[PDB]
């Protein structure tokens, strides 16, 4: 399938363009190329400081008439430093202004742990400890649901949430809108079988980021596992006349998981989208699933303490 059905009955293109770390002076071209190559799902975030450029690219493609707003599925995320009623709506409106849109198809809590306000993604004290906040994601969720009922957000979702944190929201008194997706790191070394199974059992889809093991992430020792270099994956790729990256991307699609590979390289953007004309066999999917080691490439040590740290739980 080329899309996933959300609980709201809306369609989410199973493949989208990731933009984390995409330099501001390159993401605009990346989005234009992505749209020209066929992408209709763009994943954005306030914390990426590049939404203004994404918005310029979109506006231009709509202006050209190659696409209409309705053809695109735009995703953005609320940063934990803005859980507060006021700061939340300001961050949302700012995201809407930067992207030059009137509504978002999906708005996600970028991280469960509320953080101290300010122009800092991770405010730290004198020692360097990240200052958390009392405001919870349920507090933010209530106001985010307002955006939904006012038609400014088509659906809400979460990112980097373990199943407990999702349970907290599904069973919240007076729940108005259920999350439609949990965006988490997922690839062969971190298959997320339990979390995916838990989400699907609740009618919640899963969006996989860092599908290529994110071999870019700043500070990543040389002898760290490389999914793009693994001979077994390369072998499977070659038999299908595809690249490893295309296999790592196709992997999620066959598990009915949305995947958002990131790139600012026109050629790779093009490459990551040629994943709808082939099928991995049952044995190949098993071989790939067998790579799991619950190894996280993301992981930010400075967050291991936070009460809402989501990676200690089983799933
Ligand atoms: N919610 C969160 O906490 C969170 C965290 C991280 C990321 N994300 C989202 O997930 C998206 C995934 O990006 P990511 O950095 O995490 O990891 P990724 O997509 O697995 O890997 C991105 C890296 O792979 C390179 N690349 C892309 N296509 C390639 C190909 N076909 N062959 C070889 N190399 C290729 C990119 O290089 P070039 O750009 O140089 O081509 C970049 O250095 C992000 O853009 C973002 O939207 C969300």
**What CATH number is given to the structural domain containing 36?**
3.20.20.100
What was the resolution (in A) of this experimentally determined structure?
2.4
Distances in whole angstroms, Cα of residue 239 to Cα of each of 14, 236, 243, 268, 288 = 24, 5, 10, 20, 14
Nearest CA to ligand 1 atom 30: 268
Q: What is the 3-state secondary structure (H, E, C) of 211-236?
A: CCCCCCCCCCCCCCCCCCCCHHHHHH
**Residues pairing with 18 in the sheet:** 262
Residue 263 CA: which ligand 1 atom is closest?
39
Instruction: Quickly list DSSP for 34-52.
Output: HHHHT--EEE--GGGS-HH
**Residues pairing with 190 in the sheet:** 187
Q: How far is it, in rounded angstroms, from Cα 75 to Cα 13?
A: 11
164 is an annotated ligand-binding site residue: no
232 is an annotated ligand-binding site residue: yes
Place of tokens 């959300």: 6
Range of the domain at 267: 1-315
Method: X-ray
255 is an annotated ligand-binding site residue: yes
Half-sphere exposure in the Cβ direction for 162 (13 Å, CA): 11
Each residue of 71-110: b (16+ CB within 10 Å) or e?
Answer: ebbbbbbbbbbbbbeebbbebbeebbebbbbeebbbbbbb
- Residue list, ligand 1 pocket, CB within 6 Å: 18-21, 43, 110, 159-160, 183, 209-216, 228, 245, 260-265, 268, 271-272, 298
Instruction: Tell the burial category of 200 from Cβ atoms under 10 Å away from its Cβ (0-12, 13-18, 19+).
Output: middle
Q: How many folded domains does the chain comprise?
A: 1
Q: How far is it, in rounded angstroms, from Cα 106 to Cα 179?
A: 10
Q: Which of 209, 220, 298 to mutate to test the pocket of ligand 1 (most atoms within 8 A of CB)?
A: 209
């Amino acid at each position: 399938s080329t899309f996933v059905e959300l609980s709201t009955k809306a369609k989410m293109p199973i493949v989208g363009l990731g933009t984390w770390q995409s330099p501001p002076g390159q993401v605009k071209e990346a989005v234009k190329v992505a749209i020209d190559a066929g992408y209709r799902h763009i994943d954005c975030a306030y914390a990426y400081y590049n939404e203004h450029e994404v918005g310029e690219a979109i506006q231009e493609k709509i202006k050209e008439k190659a696409v209409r707003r309705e053809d695109l599925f735009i995703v953005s995320k609320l940063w934990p430093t803005c859980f507060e009623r006021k700061l939340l709506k300001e961050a949302f409106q700012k995201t809407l202004t930067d992207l030059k849109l009137d509504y978002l198809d999906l708005y996600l809590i970028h991280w469960p742990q509320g953080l101290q306000p300010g122009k800092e993604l991770f405010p730290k004290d004198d020692q360097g400890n990240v200052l958390t906040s009392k405001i919870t994601f349920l507090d933010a969720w209530e106001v985010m649901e307002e955006l939904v009922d006012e038609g400014l957000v088509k659906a809400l979702g979460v990112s980097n949430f373990n199943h407990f944190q999702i349970e907290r929201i599904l069973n919240k008194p007076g729940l108005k809108h259920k999350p439609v997706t949990n965006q988490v790191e997922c690839h062969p070394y971190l298959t997320q079988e339990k979390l995916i199974e838990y989400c699907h059992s609740k009618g919640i889809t899963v969006t996989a980021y860092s599908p290529l093991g994110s071999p870019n992430r700043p500070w990543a020792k040389p002898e760290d596992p490389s999914l793009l270099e693994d001979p077994k994956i390369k072998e499977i790729a070659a038999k299908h006349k595809k690249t490893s990256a295309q296999v790592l991307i196709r992997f999620h699609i066959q598990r009915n998981v949305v995947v958002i590979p990131k790139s600012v390289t026109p050629a790779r953007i093009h490459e990551n989208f040629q994943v709808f004309d082939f099928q991995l066999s049952d044995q190949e999917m098993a071989t790939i699933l067998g790579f799991n080691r619950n190894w996280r490439a993301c992981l930010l040590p400075e967050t291991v303490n936070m009460e809402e740290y989501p990676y200690d739980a089983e799933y």
